[PDB]
């Protein structure tokens, strides 16, 4: 069994007939049943993508007044997903239709895109250009954005439901 990425489960031996343009021919067939190994793609592709999405969602827990920090954070997360998607698809055959891992990568990429859009929407409603001083009981200060407050629940929840549906559909 000189297989790297496959497990040879077994063989099925059979016989049949083929009716060609020149006549009927007996055809003896064997079928080797192979199952792919998934651990490589878990460690190299799925799990870094999951952690990058978790990073993109961690932006919601930073204070809204750190505009450059969250901007750089989201855009660099998008760049990281671009790199991961490129590396992932380098290791596929050039099929037309979409594989499962392609759908996973696309959904994660959409998630980081939506996280950056969420930060943009939060920043649009920020009033004051200074953060909490550290020694005041709430000069006025920006309130915690409702958008951030419920995005902290909506985004990880939606990602978890997508993960459950994905890993139930295929496994």
């Amino acid at each position, epitope marked *: 069994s000189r297989l790297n990425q496959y497990d040879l489960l*077994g063989q*099925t031996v*059979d016989s*049949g*007939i*083929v009716q060609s343009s020149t006549g009927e021919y007996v*055809v003896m*067939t064997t*079928h080797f*049943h192979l199952k792919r190994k998934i651990g490589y793609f878990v460690i190299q592709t799925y799990l870094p993508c999951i952690m990058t999405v978790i990073l993109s969602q961690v932006s919601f827990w930073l204070n809204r007044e750190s505009v450059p920090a969250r901007t750089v954070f989201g855009v660099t997360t998008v760049l990281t997903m671009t790199t991961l998607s490129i590396s992932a698809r380098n290791s596929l055959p050039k099929v037309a239709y979409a594989t499962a891992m392609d759908w996973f990568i696309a959904v994660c990429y959409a998630f980081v895109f939506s996280a950056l859009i969420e930060f943009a929407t939060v920043n649009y409603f920020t009033k004051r250009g200074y953060a909490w001083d550290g020694k005041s009981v709430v000069k006025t200060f920006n309130s915690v954005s409702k958008i951030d407050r419920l995005s902290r629940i909506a985004f990880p929840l939606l990602f978890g439901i997508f993960n459950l549906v994905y890993w139930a559909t295929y496994l």
Partner: nanobody
Amino acid sequence: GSLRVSCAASGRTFTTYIMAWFRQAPGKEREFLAAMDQGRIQYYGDSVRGRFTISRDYAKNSVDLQLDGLRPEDTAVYYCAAGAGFWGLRTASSYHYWGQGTQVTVSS
């Protein structure tokens, strides 16, 4: 008596899939009858070898089963199935697509 049971597939192209016919007599046992693969290679069950003929129209994405020499015990429900044969090609579990079925009866 002679008969021909056709099966048209819609919603997906089954060029690469193995299209097969199964039989189910009363008593709940499914019996493999015939199958054709992408290579036009015909596999048959021992009970119906040389009697039933399976063919495929890949352009129309259909599979036909010609039944010749019917006997009373052939009365059963015939199912059209498709799917790549993994661990199978003679087992119903290897097929992920199934038809509604067609009842066939023979009277003497």
